[PDB]
Write an enzyme that holds these catalytic residues in place. Sequence first.
Site, mmCIF file in Angstrom:
data_model
loop_
_atom_site.group_PDB
_atom_site.id
_atom_site.type_symbol
_atom_site.label_atom_id
_atom_site.label_comp_id
_atom_site.label_asym_id
_atom_site.label_seq_id
_atom_site.Cartn_x
_atom_site.Cartn_y
_atom_site.Cartn_z
ATOM 1 N N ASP A 54 -13.062 9.364 -8.483
ATOM 2 C CA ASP A 54 -14.152 9.597 -7.549
ATOM 3 C C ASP A 54 -13.902 10.674 -6.495
ATOM 4 O OD1 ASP A 54 -12.473 8.022 -5.848
ATOM 5 O OD2 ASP A 54 -14.193 7.171 -4.821
ATOM 6 N N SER A 67 -11.782 10.944 -4.061
ATOM 7 C CA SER A 67 -11.435 10.476 -2.710
ATOM 8 C C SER A 67 -9.908 10.372 -2.580
ATOM 9 C CB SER A 67 -12.078 9.106 -2.448
ATOM 10 O OG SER A 67 -11.463 8.083 -3.230
ATOM 11 N N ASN A 105 -9.074 5.024 2.796
ATOM 12 C CA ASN A 105 -9.889 5.906 1.963
ATOM 13 C C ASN A 105 -10.794 6.892 2.705
ATOM 14 O OD1 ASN A 105 -12.449 6.340 0.025
ATOM 15 N ND2 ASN A 105 -10.680 5.895 -1.285
ATOM 16 N N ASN A 118 -7.520 9.860 -5.767
ATOM 17 C CA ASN A 118 -8.218 9.046 -6.766
ATOM 18 C C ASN A 118 -9.076 9.990 -7.579
ATOM 19 O OD1 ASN A 118 -7.595 6.117 -5.769
ATOM 20 N ND2 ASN A 118 -8.333 7.198 -3.931
ATOM 21 N N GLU A 134 0.799 -1.214 0.000
ATOM 22 C CA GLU A 134 0.000 0.000 0.000
ATOM 23 C C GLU A 134 0.842 1.281 0.000
ATOM 24 O OE1 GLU A 134 -3.156 0.292 -0.637
ATOM 25 O OE2 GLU A 134 -4.091 -1.604 -0.102
ATOM 26 N N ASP A 150 -6.484 8.318 -0.486
ATOM 27 C CA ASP A 150 -6.020 7.233 0.369
ATOM 28 C C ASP A 150 -4.920 7.820 1.238
ATOM 29 O OD1 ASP A 150 -7.652 5.422 -1.033
ATOM 30 O OD2 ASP A 150 -6.141 5.224 -2.592
#
Length: 130
Positions: free
Chosen positions: A49, A51, A60, A46, A35, A53
């Site tokens: 959408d 959002s 998220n 991202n 990750e 991380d």
Amino acid sequence: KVFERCELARTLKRLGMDGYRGASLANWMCLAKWESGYNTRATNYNAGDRSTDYGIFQINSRYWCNDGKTPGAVNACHLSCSALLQDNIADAVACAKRVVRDPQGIRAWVAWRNRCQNRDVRQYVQGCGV
């Protein structure tokens, strides 16, 4: 902060991750590895959408933490996403515990399925003393 492997292993064990919800420490190590590469300040926006991380576990902002700019978001962990960027990973770990407690378990992170599931994950904790 960029953690060294065994340092993270020992730190996760102290926080009660080994076997948390049936997931072994080596699995948590594999997840953090793919990750963020053990980087607590890692962020991934991202575009698809709107959002983001955040942190060592790439949690998220749409369902787990609040950053204020994600459309129709929930804050299940009840934390500011800023909390997930500190060198001290206690909050992120606590939010990670809440994420796995959901219907998919550790499968919630797609990276896990791709790089960890059904593989030999021993290499992530060997010689660390955990």
